[PDB]
Design a binder for this molecule. Sequence first.
Ligand code: IPE
Ligand code: IPE
Ligand code: MG
Ligand code: MG
Ligand code: MG
Ligand code: MG
Ligand code: MG
Ligand code: MG
Ligand code: MG
Lengths: 288, 286
Amino acid sequence: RTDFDLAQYLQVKKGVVEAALDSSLAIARPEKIYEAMRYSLLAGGKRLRPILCITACELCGGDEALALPTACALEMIHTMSLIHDDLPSMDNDDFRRGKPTNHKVYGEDIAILAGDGLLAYAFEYVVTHTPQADPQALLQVIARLGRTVGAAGLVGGQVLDLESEGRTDITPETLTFIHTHKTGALLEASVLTGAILAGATGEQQQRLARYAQNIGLAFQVVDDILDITATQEEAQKATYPSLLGLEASRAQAQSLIDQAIVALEPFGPSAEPLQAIAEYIVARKYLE
Amino acid sequence: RTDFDLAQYLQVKKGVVEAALDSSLAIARPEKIYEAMRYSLLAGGKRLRPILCITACELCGGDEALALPTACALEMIHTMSLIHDDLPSMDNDDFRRGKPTNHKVYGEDIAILAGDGLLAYAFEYVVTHTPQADPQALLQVIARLGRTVGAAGLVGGQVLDLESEGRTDITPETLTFIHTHKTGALLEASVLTGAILAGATGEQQQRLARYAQNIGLAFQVVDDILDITATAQKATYPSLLGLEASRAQAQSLIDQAIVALEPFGPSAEPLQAIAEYIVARKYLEH
Ligand SMILES: C=C(C)CCOP(=O)(O)OP(=O)(O)O
Ligand SMILES: C=C(C)CCOP(=O)(O)OP(=O)(O)O
Ligand SMILES: [Mg+2]
Ligand SMILES: [Mg+2]
Ligand SMILES: [Mg+2]
Ligand SMILES: [Mg+2]
Ligand SMILES: [Mg+2]
Ligand SMILES: [Mg+2]
Ligand SMILES: [Mg+2]
Protein backbone atom coordinates (compact mmCIF):
# COMPACT_ATOMS: atom_id res chain seq x y z
CA ARG A 1 0.00 0.00 0.00
CA THR A 2 1.26 3.59 -0.63
CA ASP A 3 -0.94 5.66 1.84
CA PHE A 4 0.38 6.40 5.40
CA ASP A 5 -2.21 4.94 7.82
CA LEU A 6 -1.45 6.01 11.38
CA ALA A 7 -3.52 3.20 13.01
CA GLN A 8 -1.60 0.61 10.94
CA TYR A 9 1.77 2.36 11.70
CA LEU A 10 1.03 2.08 15.43
CA GLN A 11 -0.18 -1.56 15.13
CA VAL A 12 3.04 -2.60 13.29
CA LYS A 13 5.34 -0.78 15.78
CA LYS A 14 3.39 -2.30 18.73
CA GLY A 15 3.89 -5.79 17.20
CA VAL A 16 7.68 -5.26 16.86
CA VAL A 17 7.92 -3.97 20.45
CA GLU A 18 5.82 -6.81 21.92
CA ALA A 19 7.94 -9.49 20.13
CA ALA A 20 11.13 -7.82 21.49
CA LEU A 21 9.72 -7.58 25.06
CA ASP A 22 8.76 -11.29 24.96
CA SER A 23 12.25 -12.32 23.70
CA SER A 24 13.94 -10.02 26.33
CA LEU A 25 12.77 -12.25 29.24
CA ALA A 26 13.86 -15.87 28.74
CA ILE A 27 12.67 -17.86 31.77
CA ALA A 28 15.67 -19.06 33.92
CA ARG A 29 16.21 -19.90 37.63
CA PRO A 30 14.44 -18.68 39.68
CA GLU A 31 11.57 -19.04 37.19
CA LYS A 32 9.09 -17.17 39.43
CA ILE A 33 10.83 -13.78 39.01
CA TYR A 34 10.78 -14.08 35.19
CA GLU A 35 7.13 -15.23 35.25
CA ALA A 36 6.16 -12.28 37.47
CA MET A 37 8.05 -9.71 35.38
CA ARG A 38 6.54 -11.19 32.15
CA TYR A 39 3.02 -11.15 33.66
CA SER A 40 3.12 -7.31 33.86
CA LEU A 41 5.50 -6.53 30.93
CA LEU A 42 3.60 -8.65 28.35
CA ALA A 43 0.04 -7.57 29.44
CA GLY A 44 -0.43 -5.40 26.28
CA GLY A 45 -1.40 -1.77 26.14
CA LYS A 46 -0.69 1.01 23.70
CA ARG A 47 3.14 0.78 23.96
CA LEU A 48 3.17 4.60 23.51
CA ARG A 49 6.61 5.20 25.10
CA PRO A 50 8.54 2.62 22.97
CA ILE A 51 6.68 3.82 19.85
CA LEU A 52 7.63 7.47 20.63
CA CYS A 53 11.30 6.43 21.09
CA ILE A 54 11.46 4.56 17.72
CA THR A 55 9.56 7.34 15.94
CA ALA A 56 11.82 10.15 17.35
CA CYS A 57 14.95 8.09 16.52
CA GLU A 58 13.80 7.70 12.90
CA LEU A 59 12.83 11.42 12.75
CA CYS A 60 16.49 12.32 13.65
CA GLY A 61 17.94 9.90 11.02
CA GLY A 62 18.34 6.78 13.15
CA ASP A 63 16.73 3.38 12.57
CA GLU A 64 14.48 0.98 14.42
CA ALA A 65 17.36 -1.42 15.33
CA LEU A 66 19.19 1.49 17.07
CA ALA A 67 16.11 2.53 19.10
CA LEU A 68 14.43 -0.80 19.84
CA PRO A 69 16.44 -1.80 22.97
CA THR A 70 15.99 1.64 24.60
CA ALA A 71 12.31 1.52 23.51
CA CYS A 72 11.95 -1.79 25.40
CA ALA A 73 13.80 -0.32 28.41
CA LEU A 74 11.31 2.59 28.54
CA GLU A 75 8.42 0.09 28.60
CA MET A 76 10.20 -1.92 31.37
CA ILE A 77 10.45 1.32 33.42
CA HIS A 78 6.78 2.15 32.69
CA THR A 79 5.79 -1.38 33.71
CA MET A 80 7.83 -1.26 36.99
CA SER A 81 6.12 2.04 37.88
CA LEU A 82 2.65 0.46 37.46
CA ILE A 83 3.59 -2.64 39.54
CA HIS A 84 4.84 -0.44 42.43
CA ASP A 85 1.89 1.98 42.02
CA ASP A 86 -0.69 -0.85 42.38
CA LEU A 87 0.74 -2.19 45.70
CA PRO A 88 -1.39 -2.14 48.88
CA SER A 89 1.04 0.50 50.39
CA MET A 90 0.39 2.74 47.33
CA ASP A 91 -2.91 2.72 45.34
CA ASN A 92 -4.00 -0.79 46.57
CA ASP A 93 -5.54 -1.86 43.24
CA ASP A 94 -6.68 -5.48 42.85
CA PHE A 95 -7.11 -5.13 39.05
CA ARG A 96 -5.42 -3.49 36.09
CA ARG A 97 -6.69 -3.84 32.46
CA GLY A 98 -9.47 -6.12 33.94
CA LYS A 99 -6.79 -8.68 35.15
CA PRO A 100 -5.46 -9.23 38.72
CA THR A 101 -2.54 -6.93 39.66
CA ASN A 102 0.89 -8.47 40.05
CA HIS A 103 0.79 -8.61 43.86
CA LYS A 104 -2.65 -10.29 43.85
CA VAL A 105 -1.23 -13.09 41.65
CA TYR A 106 2.30 -13.57 43.08
CA GLY A 107 2.31 -11.76 46.45
CA GLU A 108 3.48 -8.27 47.48
CA ASP A 109 7.08 -9.49 47.98
CA ILE A 110 7.35 -10.97 44.47
CA ALA A 111 5.63 -7.86 42.96
CA ILE A 112 8.11 -5.45 44.67
CA LEU A 113 11.00 -7.62 43.44
CA ALA A 114 9.57 -7.96 39.87
CA GLY A 115 9.48 -4.14 39.67
CA ASP A 116 13.07 -3.89 40.97
CA GLY A 117 14.12 -6.55 38.44
CA LEU A 118 12.52 -4.68 35.51
CA LEU A 119 14.15 -1.37 36.49
CA ALA A 120 17.61 -3.03 36.72
CA TYR A 121 17.06 -4.88 33.43
CA ALA A 122 16.12 -1.64 31.60
CA PHE A 123 19.70 -0.35 32.14
CA GLU A 124 21.37 -3.71 31.37
CA TYR A 125 19.33 -4.20 28.19
CA VAL A 126 20.09 -0.72 26.74
CA VAL A 127 23.84 -1.51 26.94
CA THR A 128 23.91 -5.23 26.01
CA HIS A 129 21.44 -4.96 23.10
CA THR A 130 22.73 -1.69 21.50
CA PRO A 131 26.37 -2.59 20.73
CA GLN A 132 26.14 -0.64 17.39
CA ALA A 133 25.40 2.72 19.16
CA ASP A 134 27.95 5.51 19.58
CA PRO A 135 29.25 4.83 23.12
CA GLN A 136 28.98 8.50 24.28
CA ALA A 137 25.35 8.62 22.98
CA LEU A 138 24.56 5.39 24.84
CA LEU A 139 26.04 6.81 28.08
CA GLN A 140 23.85 9.94 27.60
CA VAL A 141 20.78 7.62 27.24
CA ILE A 142 21.73 5.85 30.52
CA ALA A 143 22.11 9.21 32.34
CA ARG A 144 18.76 10.43 30.97
CA LEU A 145 16.97 7.20 32.01
CA GLY A 146 18.43 7.42 35.56
CA ARG A 147 17.43 11.10 35.92
CA THR A 148 13.96 10.33 34.43
CA VAL A 149 13.17 7.50 36.85
CA GLY A 150 14.47 9.04 40.06
CA ALA A 151 13.56 11.78 42.51
CA ALA A 152 13.73 14.54 39.84
CA GLY A 153 11.36 12.60 37.56
CA LEU A 154 8.93 9.67 37.89
CA VAL A 155 9.63 8.71 41.56
CA GLY A 156 9.43 12.40 42.56
CA GLY A 157 6.13 12.58 40.71
CA GLN A 158 4.81 9.51 42.54
CA VAL A 159 5.74 11.19 45.89
CA LEU A 160 4.07 14.52 44.78
CA ASP A 161 0.94 12.51 43.78
CA LEU A 162 0.85 10.62 47.15
CA GLU A 163 1.29 13.94 48.99
CA SER A 164 -1.73 15.44 47.14
CA GLU A 165 -4.09 12.56 48.09
CA GLY A 166 -7.02 13.82 50.10
CA ARG A 167 -5.67 17.38 50.38
CA THR A 168 -8.09 20.32 50.28
CA ASP A 169 -5.75 22.97 48.81
CA ILE A 170 -5.00 21.53 45.32
CA THR A 171 -4.58 24.19 42.58
CA PRO A 172 -3.99 23.77 38.84
CA GLU A 173 -0.30 24.62 39.52
CA THR A 174 -0.11 21.68 42.03
CA LEU A 175 -1.65 19.26 39.50
CA THR A 176 0.65 20.42 36.69
CA PHE A 177 3.72 19.99 38.97
CA ILE A 178 2.64 16.40 39.70
CA HIS A 179 1.99 15.59 36.03
CA THR A 180 5.28 17.04 34.69
CA HIS A 181 7.19 14.67 37.03
CA LYS A 182 4.91 11.61 37.16
CA THR A 183 4.27 11.28 33.40
CA GLY A 184 6.02 14.17 31.59
CA ALA A 185 9.58 13.11 32.52
CA LEU A 186 9.20 9.60 31.03
CA LEU A 187 7.36 10.85 27.90
CA GLU A 188 10.21 13.43 27.39
CA ALA A 189 12.76 10.61 27.93
CA SER A 190 11.01 8.46 25.32
CA VAL A 191 11.48 11.02 22.49
CA LEU A 192 14.84 12.39 23.76
CA THR A 193 16.52 8.99 24.13
CA GLY A 194 15.56 8.14 20.52
CA ALA A 195 16.91 11.55 19.41
CA ILE A 196 20.16 11.22 21.41
CA LEU A 197 20.83 7.76 19.91
CA ALA A 198 20.50 9.27 16.40
CA GLY A 199 22.86 12.20 17.24
CA ALA A 200 20.16 14.95 17.29
CA THR A 201 21.37 18.50 18.07
CA GLY A 202 20.53 20.29 21.32
CA GLU A 203 18.12 22.49 19.32
CA GLN A 204 16.29 19.43 17.93
CA GLN A 205 16.13 17.87 21.42
CA GLN A 206 14.61 21.10 22.88
CA ARG A 207 11.78 20.94 20.24
CA LEU A 208 11.06 17.26 21.05
CA ALA A 209 11.08 18.02 24.80
CA ARG A 210 8.46 20.78 24.28
CA TYR A 211 6.36 18.34 22.17
CA ALA A 212 6.54 15.65 24.86
CA GLN A 213 5.77 17.96 27.83
CA ASN A 214 2.76 19.44 25.94
CA ILE A 215 1.24 16.11 24.83
CA GLY A 216 1.73 14.65 28.32
CA LEU A 217 -0.19 17.47 29.97
CA ALA A 218 -2.84 17.51 27.22
CA PHE A 219 -3.48 13.77 27.74
CA GLN A 220 -4.02 14.35 31.51
CA VAL A 221 -6.37 17.35 30.89
CA VAL A 222 -8.39 15.26 28.37
CA ASP A 223 -8.63 12.31 30.84
CA ASP A 224 -10.02 14.78 33.45
CA ILE A 225 -12.53 16.25 30.90
CA LEU A 226 -13.81 12.75 30.06
CA ASP A 227 -14.05 11.78 33.81
CA ILE A 228 -16.19 14.87 34.67
CA THR A 229 -18.44 14.40 31.58
CA ALA A 230 -18.96 10.64 32.44
CA THR A 231 -20.05 11.85 35.95
CA GLN A 232 -22.44 14.18 33.99
CA GLU A 233 -23.81 11.05 32.16
CA GLU A 234 -23.97 9.12 35.51
CA ALA A 235 -12.65 10.30 48.28
CA GLN A 236 -12.34 13.90 46.99
CA LYS A 237 -9.94 14.60 44.09
CA ALA A 238 -9.66 17.99 42.29
CA THR A 239 -9.23 17.91 38.50
CA TYR A 240 -8.58 20.49 35.78
CA PRO A 241 -12.34 20.91 35.03
CA SER A 242 -13.29 21.07 38.74
CA LEU A 243 -10.65 23.81 39.31
CA LEU A 244 -10.90 25.74 35.99
CA GLY A 245 -14.26 24.80 34.48
CA LEU A 246 -14.81 22.60 31.41
CA GLU A 247 -14.58 25.50 28.86
CA ALA A 248 -11.13 26.60 30.16
CA SER A 249 -9.96 22.93 30.41
CA ARG A 250 -11.00 22.20 26.79
CA ALA A 251 -9.22 25.41 25.59
CA GLN A 252 -6.03 24.43 27.54
CA ALA A 253 -6.03 20.84 26.12
CA GLN A 254 -6.44 22.17 22.55
CA SER A 255 -3.70 24.81 23.09
CA LEU A 256 -1.26 22.19 24.43
CA ILE A 257 -1.85 19.88 21.38
CA ASP A 258 -1.53 22.87 19.00
CA GLN A 259 1.76 23.89 20.68
CA ALA A 260 3.09 20.31 20.50
CA ILE A 261 2.40 20.26 16.73
CA VAL A 262 4.00 23.70 16.17
CA ALA A 263 7.05 22.63 18.21
CA LEU A 264 7.92 19.99 15.56
CA GLU A 265 7.15 22.05 12.40
CA PRO A 266 10.83 23.05 11.95
CA PHE A 267 11.77 19.36 11.36
CA GLY A 268 9.79 19.55 8.13
CA PRO A 269 7.40 16.85 6.84
CA SER A 270 9.46 14.08 8.55
CA ALA A 271 7.73 15.17 11.83
CA GLU A 272 4.19 14.39 10.49
CA PRO A 273 3.87 10.97 12.22
CA LEU A 274 4.77 12.41 15.67
CA GLN A 275 2.48 15.41 15.06
CA ALA A 276 -0.37 13.05 14.01
CA ILE A 277 0.17 10.85 17.10
CA ALA A 278 -0.58 13.84 19.36
CA GLU A 279 -4.05 14.39 17.80
CA TYR A 280 -4.75 10.67 17.33
CA ILE A 281 -4.24 9.74 21.02
CA VAL A 282 -6.69 12.54 22.03
CA ALA A 283 -9.27 11.52 19.38
CA ARG A 284 -9.10 7.86 20.53
CA LYS A 285 -9.64 8.91 24.22
CA TYR A 286 -12.92 10.60 23.14
CA LEU A 287 -13.95 7.48 21.11
CA GLU A 288 -12.95 4.90 23.81
CA ARG B 1 53.47 6.96 59.90
CA THR B 2 55.26 4.11 58.09
CA ASP B 3 53.16 1.04 59.12
CA PHE B 4 50.17 0.07 56.89
CA ASP B 5 47.17 0.09 59.31
CA LEU B 6 44.10 -1.51 57.73
CA ALA B 7 41.68 0.06 60.25
CA GLN B 8 43.03 3.53 59.38
CA TYR B 9 42.92 2.74 55.61
CA LEU B 10 39.25 1.78 55.94
CA GLN B 11 38.40 4.84 58.09
CA VAL B 12 39.89 7.22 55.47
CA LYS B 13 38.15 5.48 52.50
CA LYS B 14 34.86 5.42 54.49
CA GLY B 15 35.18 9.20 55.11
CA VAL B 16 35.71 9.91 51.37
CA VAL B 17 32.72 7.73 50.44
CA GLU B 18 30.43 9.24 53.10
CA ALA B 19 31.29 12.85 52.04
CA ALA B 20 30.51 11.96 48.39
CA LEU B 21 27.19 10.27 49.33
CA ASP B 22 26.14 13.28 51.43
CA SER B 23 26.98 15.75 48.60
CA SER B 24 25.17 13.46 46.05
CA LEU B 25 21.69 14.26 47.50
CA ALA B 26 20.77 17.97 47.78
CA ILE B 27 17.23 18.35 49.14
CA ALA B 28 14.76 19.64 46.45
CA ARG B 29 10.99 19.30 45.91
CA PRO B 30 9.51 16.93 46.98
CA GLU B 31 11.67 17.18 50.10
CA LYS B 32 10.34 13.95 51.67
CA ILE B 33 11.85 11.71 48.96
CA TYR B 34 15.34 13.27 49.41
CA GLU B 35 14.98 13.05 53.23
CA ALA B 36 13.98 9.34 52.94
CA MET B 37 16.82 8.47 50.51
CA ARG B 38 19.36 10.36 52.70
CA TYR B 39 18.06 8.71 55.90
CA SER B 40 19.02 5.22 54.61
CA LEU B 41 22.04 6.16 52.44
CA LEU B 42 23.78 8.22 55.16
CA ALA B 43 23.10 5.72 58.03
CA GLY B 44 26.81 4.73 58.20
CA GLY B 45 28.10 1.17 58.36
CA LYS B 46 31.23 -0.43 56.99
CA ARG B 47 30.83 0.90 53.39
CA LEU B 48 32.42 -2.44 52.32
CA ARG B 49 31.20 -2.43 48.70
CA PRO B 50 32.40 1.12 47.81
CA ILE B 51 35.71 0.44 49.59
CA LEU B 52 36.12 -2.88 47.64
CA CYS B 53 35.52 -0.93 44.38
CA ILE B 54 38.12 1.79 45.17
CA THR B 55 40.60 -0.80 46.46
CA ALA B 56 40.24 -3.06 43.36
CA CYS B 57 40.54 0.00 41.07
CA GLU B 58 43.78 1.07 42.81
CA LEU B 59 45.11 -2.56 42.72
CA CYS B 60 44.64 -2.57 38.89
CA GLY B 61 46.40 0.80 38.38
CA GLY B 62 43.41 3.13 38.66
CA ASP B 63 42.72 5.70 41.36
CA GLU B 64 40.10 6.80 43.85
CA ALA B 65 38.72 9.62 41.65
CA LEU B 66 38.07 7.13 38.78
CA ALA B 67 36.31 4.64 41.11
CA LEU B 68 34.45 6.98 43.49
CA PRO B 69 31.24 7.50 41.44
CA THR B 70 30.83 3.74 40.79
CA ALA B 71 31.68 3.12 44.46
CA CYS B 72 28.84 5.48 45.43
CA ALA B 73 26.48 3.75 42.95
CA LEU B 74 27.29 0.35 44.54
CA GLU B 75 26.37 1.73 47.98
CA MET B 76 23.15 3.31 46.56
CA ILE B 77 22.23 -0.17 45.19
CA HIS B 78 23.15 -1.86 48.50
CA THR B 79 21.04 0.73 50.36
CA MET B 80 17.99 0.21 48.03
CA SER B 81 18.22 -3.56 48.60
CA LEU B 82 18.09 -3.11 52.43
CA ILE B 83 15.16 -0.62 52.26
CA HIS B 84 13.11 -3.10 50.19
CA ASP B 85 14.25 -6.12 52.32
CA ASP B 86 13.07 -4.40 55.57
CA LEU B 87 9.50 -3.71 54.30
CA PRO B 88 6.47 -5.33 55.96
CA SER B 89 5.85 -7.42 52.73
CA MET B 90 9.43 -8.79 53.08
CA ASP B 91 11.26 -9.18 56.43
CA ASN B 92 9.03 -6.67 58.34
CA ASP B 93 11.98 -5.24 60.37
CA ASP B 94 11.28 -2.21 62.59
CA PHE B 95 15.03 -1.59 63.19
CA ARG B 96 18.30 -1.68 61.30
CA ARG B 97 21.63 -0.96 63.10
CA GLY B 98 19.50 -0.08 66.20
CA LYS B 99 17.65 2.75 64.31
CA PRO B 100 14.10 2.74 62.83
CA THR B 101 13.85 1.28 59.33
CA ASN B 102 12.97 3.63 56.44
CA HIS B 103 9.26 2.61 56.30
CA LYS B 104 8.85 3.17 60.06
CA VAL B 105 10.02 6.79 59.64
CA TYR B 106 8.54 7.76 56.21
CA GLY B 107 5.85 5.11 55.54
CA GLU B 108 5.88 1.98 53.33
CA ASP B 109 4.97 3.96 50.16
CA ILE B 110 7.83 6.48 50.56
CA ALA B 111 10.29 3.67 51.51
CA ILE B 112 9.45 1.67 48.32
CA LEU B 113 9.92 4.86 46.26
CA ALA B 114 13.17 5.88 48.06
CA GLY B 115 14.58 2.47 47.10
CA ASP B 116 13.49 2.97 43.46
CA GLY B 117 15.00 6.48 43.48
CA LEU B 118 18.36 5.23 44.80
CA LEU B 119 18.54 2.44 42.18
CA ALA B 120 17.82 4.99 39.39
CA TYR B 121 20.33 7.49 40.79
CA ALA B 122 23.11 4.83 40.90
CA PHE B 123 23.09 4.67 37.06
CA GLU B 124 22.81 8.47 36.59
CA TYR B 125 25.64 9.14 39.06
CA VAL B 126 28.09 6.67 37.44
CA VAL B 127 27.72 8.34 34.03
CA THR B 128 27.58 12.02 35.07
CA HIS B 129 30.57 11.91 37.47
CA THR B 130 33.06 9.68 35.53
CA PRO B 131 33.88 11.67 32.35
CA GLN B 132 37.52 10.44 32.53
CA ALA B 133 36.59 6.71 32.12
CA ASP B 134 36.96 4.97 28.76
CA PRO B 135 33.36 5.11 27.46
CA GLN B 136 33.23 1.38 26.55
CA ALA B 137 34.60 0.49 30.06
CA LEU B 138 31.94 2.70 31.65
CA LEU B 139 29.23 0.98 29.54
CA GLN B 140 30.59 -2.43 30.77
CA VAL B 141 30.22 -1.08 34.38
CA ILE B 142 26.59 -0.07 33.66
CA ALA B 143 25.77 -3.49 32.15
CA ARG B 144 27.45 -5.23 35.16
CA LEU B 145 25.47 -3.09 37.65
CA GLY B 146 22.13 -3.81 35.91
CA ARG B 147 22.86 -7.58 35.68
CA THR B 148 24.02 -7.58 39.34
CA VAL B 149 20.81 -6.03 40.70
CA GLY B 150 18.24 -7.93 38.62
CA ALA B 151 16.85 -11.43 38.19
CA ALA B 152 20.28 -12.98 37.53
CA GLY B 153 21.72 -11.33 40.68
CA LEU B 154 20.43 -9.73 43.88
CA VAL B 155 16.67 -9.74 43.05
CA GLY B 156 16.92 -13.39 41.91
CA GLY B 157 18.72 -14.11 45.20
CA GLN B 158 15.93 -12.48 47.19
CA VAL B 159 13.38 -14.74 45.36
CA LEU B 160 15.55 -17.89 45.92
CA ASP B 161 15.83 -16.94 49.65
CA LEU B 162 11.96 -16.54 49.95
CA GLU B 163 11.54 -19.92 48.16
CA SER B 164 13.81 -21.67 50.71
CA GLU B 165 11.56 -20.84 53.74
CA GLY B 166 10.01 -23.88 55.47
CA ARG B 167 11.52 -26.43 53.02
CA THR B 168 13.04 -29.85 54.00
CA ASP B 169 15.22 -30.35 50.86
CA ILE B 170 17.70 -27.43 51.22
CA THR B 171 21.27 -28.66 50.75
CA PRO B 172 24.55 -26.81 51.28
CA GLU B 173 24.66 -26.44 47.44
CA THR B 174 21.14 -24.89 47.37
CA LEU B 175 22.05 -22.50 50.21
CA THR B 176 25.25 -21.50 48.38
CA PHE B 177 23.17 -20.86 45.19
CA ILE B 178 20.98 -18.42 47.20
CA HIS B 179 24.03 -16.61 48.60
CA THR B 180 25.97 -16.31 45.32
CA HIS B 181 22.94 -14.41 43.91
CA LYS B 182 21.73 -12.53 47.01
CA THR B 183 25.14 -11.13 48.14
CA GLY B 184 27.89 -12.68 45.93
CA ALA B 185 26.82 -10.88 42.70
CA LEU B 186 27.08 -7.41 44.30
CA LEU B 187 30.37 -8.19 46.09
CA GLU B 188 31.79 -9.48 42.76
CA ALA B 189 30.42 -6.37 40.98
CA SER B 190 32.16 -4.13 43.60
CA VAL B 191 35.67 -5.49 42.80
CA LEU B 192 35.07 -6.11 39.06
CA THR B 193 33.68 -2.62 38.31
CA GLY B 194 36.77 -1.08 39.94
CA ALA B 195 38.98 -3.44 37.89
CA ILE B 196 37.09 -2.74 34.62
CA LEU B 197 37.42 1.06 35.12
CA ALA B 198 41.20 0.58 35.54
CA GLY B 199 41.51 -1.62 32.40
CA ALA B 200 42.25 -4.90 34.19
CA THR B 201 42.87 -7.96 32.00
CA GLY B 202 40.33 -10.81 31.86
CA GLU B 203 42.86 -12.92 33.82
CA GLN B 204 43.03 -10.28 36.64
CA GLN B 205 39.23 -9.97 36.65
CA GLN B 206 38.85 -13.80 37.03
CA ARG B 207 41.13 -13.74 40.15
CA LEU B 208 39.12 -10.84 41.69
CA ALA B 209 35.83 -12.69 40.97
CA ARG B 210 37.14 -15.79 42.79
CA TYR B 211 38.22 -13.57 45.73
CA ALA B 212 34.79 -11.89 45.88
CA GLN B 213 32.75 -15.12 45.62
CA ASN B 214 34.87 -16.75 48.38
CA ILE B 215 34.71 -13.81 50.84
CA GLY B 216 30.96 -13.44 50.23
CA LEU B 217 30.29 -17.09 51.06
CA ALA B 218 32.70 -17.02 54.05
CA PHE B 219 30.80 -14.00 55.48
CA GLN B 220 27.49 -15.92 55.18
CA VAL B 221 28.94 -19.11 56.80
CA VAL B 222 30.36 -17.02 59.69
CA ASP B 223 27.00 -15.20 60.14
CA ASP B 224 25.29 -18.63 60.42
CA ILE B 225 27.94 -19.91 62.92
CA LEU B 226 27.50 -16.85 65.13
CA ASP B 227 23.64 -17.04 64.96
CA ILE B 228 23.54 -20.75 66.02
CA THR B 229 26.09 -20.24 68.84
CA ALA B 230 24.06 -17.20 70.13
CA THR B 231 20.99 -19.54 70.10
CA ALA B 232 10.25 -18.51 59.91
CA GLN B 233 12.18 -21.80 59.50
CA LYS B 234 15.34 -21.81 57.31
CA ALA B 235 18.31 -24.21 57.09
CA THR B 236 21.77 -22.78 57.79
CA TYR B 237 25.30 -24.03 57.18
CA PRO B 238 25.61 -25.39 60.78
CA SER B 239 22.11 -26.94 60.73
CA LEU B 240 23.03 -28.77 57.45
CA LEU B 241 26.75 -29.54 58.00
CA GLY B 242 27.31 -29.28 61.75
CA LEU B 243 29.41 -26.59 63.41
CA GLU B 244 32.84 -28.30 62.97
CA ALA B 245 32.41 -28.61 59.15
CA SER B 246 30.94 -25.07 58.94
CA ARG B 247 33.98 -23.58 60.78
CA ALA B 248 36.37 -25.56 58.48
CA GLN B 249 34.50 -24.32 55.36
CA ALA B 250 34.59 -20.65 56.55
CA GLN B 251 38.38 -20.89 57.09
CA SER B 252 38.92 -22.65 53.71
CA LEU B 253 36.93 -19.93 51.86
CA ILE B 254 38.97 -17.10 53.46
CA ASP B 255 42.20 -19.00 52.69
CA GLN B 256 41.12 -19.46 49.02
CA ALA B 257 40.22 -15.73 48.71
CA ILE B 258 43.71 -14.76 49.94
CA VAL B 259 45.46 -17.24 47.60
CA ALA B 260 43.38 -16.01 44.62
CA LEU B 261 45.05 -12.54 44.87
CA GLU B 262 48.67 -13.67 45.55
CA PRO B 263 49.65 -13.37 41.85
CA PHE B 264 49.03 -9.59 41.94
CA GLY B 265 52.01 -9.32 44.31
CA PRO B 266 52.13 -7.15 47.45
CA SER B 267 49.69 -4.58 45.93
CA ALA B 268 46.89 -7.09 46.81
CA GLU B 269 47.69 -6.97 50.58
CA PRO B 270 44.86 -4.51 51.47
CA LEU B 271 42.18 -6.62 49.71
CA GLN B 272 43.64 -9.81 51.24
CA ALA B 273 43.59 -8.20 54.73
CA ILE B 274 39.95 -6.98 54.30
CA ALA B 275 38.85 -10.64 53.96
CA GLU B 276 40.28 -11.60 57.39
CA TYR B 277 39.34 -8.25 59.03
CA ILE B 278 35.59 -8.46 58.20
CA VAL B 279 35.45 -12.02 59.71
CA ALA B 280 37.43 -10.94 62.80
CA ARG B 281 35.08 -7.96 63.40
CA LYS B 282 31.98 -10.23 63.06
CA TYR B 283 33.34 -12.44 65.93
CA LEU B 284 34.19 -9.30 68.03
CA GLU B 285 30.81 -7.57 67.36
CA HIS B 286 29.33 -10.93 68.64
C1 IPE C 1 3.67 6.64 37.44
C2 IPE C 1 2.40 6.42 37.12
C3 IPE C 1 1.71 7.23 36.06
C4 IPE C 1 1.55 5.43 37.87
C5 IPE C 1 0.09 5.35 37.51
O1 IPE C 1 -0.65 6.57 37.89
P1 IPE C 1 -1.94 6.57 38.83
O2 IPE C 1 -1.92 5.73 40.13
O3 IPE C 1 -2.46 7.96 38.91
O4 IPE C 1 -2.84 5.82 37.74
P2 IPE C 1 -3.39 4.33 37.49
O5 IPE C 1 -2.68 3.75 36.19
O6 IPE C 1 -3.07 3.62 38.76
O7 IPE C 1 -4.88 4.54 37.25
C1 IPE D 1 19.84 -8.33 49.56
C2 IPE D 1 20.20 -8.44 50.83
C3 IPE D 1 21.62 -8.80 51.15
C4 IPE D 1 19.23 -8.27 51.98
C5 IPE D 1 19.72 -8.70 53.40
O1 IPE D 1 19.55 -10.10 53.82
P1 IPE D 1 18.42 -10.60 54.81
O2 IPE D 1 16.92 -10.14 55.15
O3 IPE D 1 18.73 -12.04 54.90
O4 IPE D 1 19.49 -9.76 55.72
P2 IPE D 1 19.15 -8.90 57.03
O5 IPE D 1 17.72 -8.71 56.90
O6 IPE D 1 19.59 -9.84 58.13
O7 IPE D 1 19.94 -7.61 56.99
MG1 MG E 1 -0.81 6.21 41.81
MG1 MG F 1 -2.53 3.96 40.60
MG1 MG G 1 -6.49 13.23 36.28
MG1 MG H 1 4.81 20.17 8.85
MG1 MG I 1 15.56 -10.83 53.66
MG1 MG J 1 22.38 -17.05 57.02
MG1 MG K 1 51.23 -11.53 48.82
